[PDB]
Structures are given as C-alpha cells and as structure tokens.
Write a protein that binds this ligand. Structure first.
Ligand SMILES: [Zn+2]
Ligand SMILES: [Zn+2]
Lengths: 367, 177
C-alpha cells in the first residue's frame, strides 16, 4: 500500500501546483487586468505586491515539476525543489506586505462604491462568488507553507532508501525556505520599529539599523566620570551600542553612543545598579534603574546584545566571526542552509569571509 | 448572504486537514489522506436557514510564528483542535493556541474540538500510547479545558467515521449567528 500512497502523493504534488498556478492566473486575469481601469498605479502596487513575479516563477516551476514527475522513477523531483529554493525567496516580500495590501484593499473598497461593485463582479467571473479578492490574496502564503508537508509525506511513503535520502534534501530545502520567509517578515517588522525609533532620535551619527536589533528602551539614571551625580536619561539598547539620550519634548537627543564591543557589564527606588565599563578604559558608567525588576530586565538584555557581538565559538578553529549584514542570498558554510532575514542574518569570518549562522560557528571547517 | 470565515487551528497531525476533507466531501478521504485542503466555500443549511460557510485549513503554518497569524484577521469562528490520542496536542491548546488566537482576535468565538474519536476506543492505539507512558484524553478532561479557555462548546468527532462531524460545523455556525 506504501507504493500506492507514494504515487497518490506524486499526483497530488502536480495537481495542487496546477490549481495554485491557475489561482495566480485568475488573480492576474480576472482581478488585476480589470482593476487597472479603476485603481491608480500606487494602489495596484500596494494591493497586488509581487503576485506577477509569483505567477512567472510558478508557471516555470510547474513545467519543470511535470517534467521531473514524467521521468523514470521521478528521480529528479528533489532537484526541482532545490533548484527553485532561492527563487522562492520572493515569498519574503509577499508575506511581509500582504497585511498592508489587504488593509489597503478594504480601505479603497469601503471608500469607493464602484470598486466594491467591480470586485463583486470580478469574483463572480473568476469563481462564481466563492472567493473574494481579499481571500485570494492569502492563497500564496498558504501554498509556500505546503511544500514541506507534501515532501514530508512523500518521504514517509516511499520504500526506496535512495529516493528517501534525496527527497530529504528537498524537504530540508523547503523547511529552510519556510523559515527564511518567516524571518524576512520578522526582520521587516523589526525594521519598522527601528525606523520609528530613528525618527524620534536627534543627532544620530548613522542609520540606527547599523547598531543591530533593539533590545530594550526606557528611563534610567546615569553617572559618568565626566558627570558624577545621577542625571536623568533615556536609553535605547541595541546589539552594538547603548544610545544614551536626553528627552527633549517628544524627541530624544543623543548624548553618547556606548560601544558594546568594548564595554562590559559588571554587577530603595533608583538604588538598583550595575556598571558599564571598558576593559581598560578611562570612562565608566553607573546605570541606575527605578526597580530591581527593571535592573534584571536590562542586565538580561545586555547579556543578549554582547552574546550577539561575541557569540560562542566566534574564534573557533582559527576564525574571527563578526555580525554581518548580507546584501545577497547567502548559504552557511557549516550547514549549507540559507542565512535568514534581511539584515544582520548571521556572521562572516573576518579572515576567510565564510558566512555562518550563530548556531553553526563551531561547525565551520577550520579557517 | 454573509461569507462566514471558519479557521481550523491546532498542532500538526491532529488531522485538521482530514476533518475538513471528510466534512466538505462527506465521504472519508480513504487510505490516502491528501495533504492539501484548499479554501472551501459552500452553502450549508443550519436551523432552516442557508449560510455561506468559508473553511480555512492552517496545515503547514504551525511552526512559523510570524506567518501563522496571517490567517487570523476577519475570522468569524475558530475551531481549536487537538487529538484525543495525543496529550501533547491537548497541552498546546492552553500553552500555544488559545493564547495566540485570543491575542489576535479578542472577541472571536472558539469551539474546542477533540479529533480522532474513533481511536480512543481502538485496541492498537491504546497499546502504543500505554507503551509511550500515555493515555487518551477523556470527555470530562476535554470539557474542563473548554471551560478553562472560555470556548463556546466542547465537541468530539471522527474524520474517519464522521461521528460528530456535522455537529462541529453546525455549532461553529450557531456560535456566530
Ligand atoms: Zn575563517
Ligand atoms: Zn548553518
């Protein structure tokens, strides 16, 4: 019965891909084309995002998929998935923008009776009123997250140990893809938070995202060598620095960027404190917090920030790994899976330029 | 005629897909369970009145914390599912699914659904669970969880035998109307 289930599964892979590609086609031909006469280019871009790229990629994917399945033993099927893994990274953009697209579609349709009526017509023409455009826009998110499931099942059914091994490579690829799409969404959300912080800070020396991911922000009292008594400050902790600011109205003026490459943590109201001190430096800070609970929370976040700058195994096996923002699709030198997200995705060895995930540093072959 | 959005959430392999396929097609999918349930829309008669029921599977999304919630906005009713022969999936209802669903959708009705009813009584399944130091979830236990999370109702069903299946979706629709 295992072989029967194997062949059913192969057929489902093809049939569901055909249906999906046709759904993308229907969006393009029954909704996009007609709505161009109703919506400004700006509106079209916001609502449909990169659906046309998805249609182009999947049309070709489907052809290669059908070719693989028609070949003896479907032995090249795993290659098609692996081949398209990086092409499918376009889902990063789609899934990061689909909420905004859906929101904007609802807004235009509520504002404009003629658009609402056209949408009802388009739905009727496309699918007999079964599915709204708003619903259809979620189908791509659904699809990209089916691939790992279909492959997981295929692996289970086939009794061919060679085919199992090859398909496991494709399963790994589609799980990797799904994680990448998830991390792109997370990074875009984080970047929105960073942009909002940046707009409220005055006198920044550089883009705030250069400092990495936000950890914690809030009120504290600080003493310095240059200023001995407790002064009220507002701080933003990111991976690479503590940005000490003074609240001026609704904005924050940057007074000091404390570089965490150098500075290390040494352990009533406002008495709860720890030191931020440089290894051999002339400058040291005392950071005072309102409560013990706030002190604990900040110390924990400082630990996380420093762990990102100086991860376990950063200098293992001759390497010198440092936080790095990759601007092109990149694979980890240890595990061969993709670096995930849109900025500070992992590490790059200063010496040999090997890219690696934080978790993989000790497993990269010697420098 | 409103298009009532019902979204099915829960751990993988509690048979969310099986449940949806069995209901929408009536017959049990057979010995091959398809992996894919695409969004479905059809008229159902509940208490003398026609209702347009939209059904959404979430299979494949469970491990992806930022993508998972994309399914939630504008949902009219959730089915939060666990398998009666998987205590781990039952625990994830309180630990993962209910709190996430409640956060994104403060006011949306929840139905708590115990799946694989046919297997709780199955000799071989009782054996392999006992083997793993496990025991199936009982009706009072399921009912208690439903009260704990403030579910509208607790229901048990079998995709395979279709026992209690029509009731699940009838009650989902009633919870909205
Ligand atoms: Zn190196
Ligand atoms: Zn790696």
């Amino acid at each position: 019965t295992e072989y029967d289930k194997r062949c059913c599964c192969l057929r489902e892979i093809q049939q569901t891909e055909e249906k999906y590609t046709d759904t993308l086609g229907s969006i393009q031909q029954h909704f996009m084309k007609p709505l161009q006469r109703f919506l400004k280019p700006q509106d079209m871009e916001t609502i449909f995002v990169n659906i046309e790229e998805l249609f182009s990629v999947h049309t070709h994917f489907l052809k290669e998929l059908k070719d693989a399945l028609a070949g003896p033993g479907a032995t090249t099927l795993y290659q098609v998935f692996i081949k398209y893994k990086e092409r499918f990274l376009v889902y990063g953009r789609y899934c990061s923008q689909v909420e905004s697209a859906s929101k904007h579609l609802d807004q235009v349709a509520t504002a404009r009776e003629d658009v609402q009526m056209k949408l009802e017509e388009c739905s009727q023409r496309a699918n007999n009123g079964r599915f709204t455009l708003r619903d259809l826009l979620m189908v791509p998110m659904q699809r990209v997250l089916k691939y790992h499931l279909l492959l997981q099942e295929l692996v289970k059914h086939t009794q061919d140990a060679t085919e199992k091994e090859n398909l496991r490579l494709a399963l790994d690829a589609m799980r990797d893809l799904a994680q990448c799409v998830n991390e792109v969404k997370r990074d875009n959300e984080t970047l929105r938070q960073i942009t909002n912080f940046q707009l409220s800070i005055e006198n920044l020396d550089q883009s705030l995202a250069n400092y990495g991911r936000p950890k914690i922000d809030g009120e504290l009292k600080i003493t310095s060598v240059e200023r001995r008594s407790k002064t009220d400050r507002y701080a933003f902790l990111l991976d690479k620095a503590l940005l000490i600011c003074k609240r001026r109205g609704d904005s924050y003026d940057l007074k000091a960027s404390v570089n965490l490459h150098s500075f290390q943590v040494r352990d009533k109201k406002w008495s709860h404190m720890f030191l931020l001190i440089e290894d051999q430096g002339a400058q040291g800070y005392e950071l005072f917090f309102k409560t013990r609970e706030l002190k604990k929370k900040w110390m924990e976040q400082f630990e996380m920030a420093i762990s990102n700058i100086y991860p376990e195994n950063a200098t293992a096996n001759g390497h010198d790994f440092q936080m790095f923002s990759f601007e092109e699709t990149t694979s980890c030198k240890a595990c061969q899976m993709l670096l995930r997200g849109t900025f500070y995705q992992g590490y790059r060895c200063y010496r040999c330029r090997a890219p690696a995930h934080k978790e993989c540093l000790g497993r990269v072959p010697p420098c | 005629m409103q298009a009532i959005k019902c979204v099915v959430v829960g751990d993988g392999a509690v048979g969310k897909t099986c449940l949806l396929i069995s209901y929408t097609t009536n017959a049990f999918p057979g010995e091959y369970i398809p992996t894919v349930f695409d969004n479905y829309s059809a008229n159902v008669m509940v208490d003398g009145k026609p209702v347009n029921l939209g059904l959404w599977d979430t299979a494949g999304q469970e491990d992806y914390d930022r993508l998972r919630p994309l399914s939630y906005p504008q949902t009219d009713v959730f089915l939060i599912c666990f398998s009666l022969v998987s205590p781990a999936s039952f625990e994830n209802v309180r630990a993962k699914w209910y709190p996430e669903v409640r956060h994104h959708c403060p006011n949306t009705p929840i139905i708590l659904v115990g799946t694989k009813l046919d297997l709780r009584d199955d000799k071989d399944t009782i054996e392999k669970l006992k083997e793993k130091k496990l025991t199936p979830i009982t009706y009072p236990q399921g009912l208690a969880m439903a009260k704990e999370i403030g579910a509208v109702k607790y229901l048990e069903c079998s995709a395979l035998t279709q026992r209690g299946l029509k009731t699940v979706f009838d009650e989902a629709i009633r919870a909205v109307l």
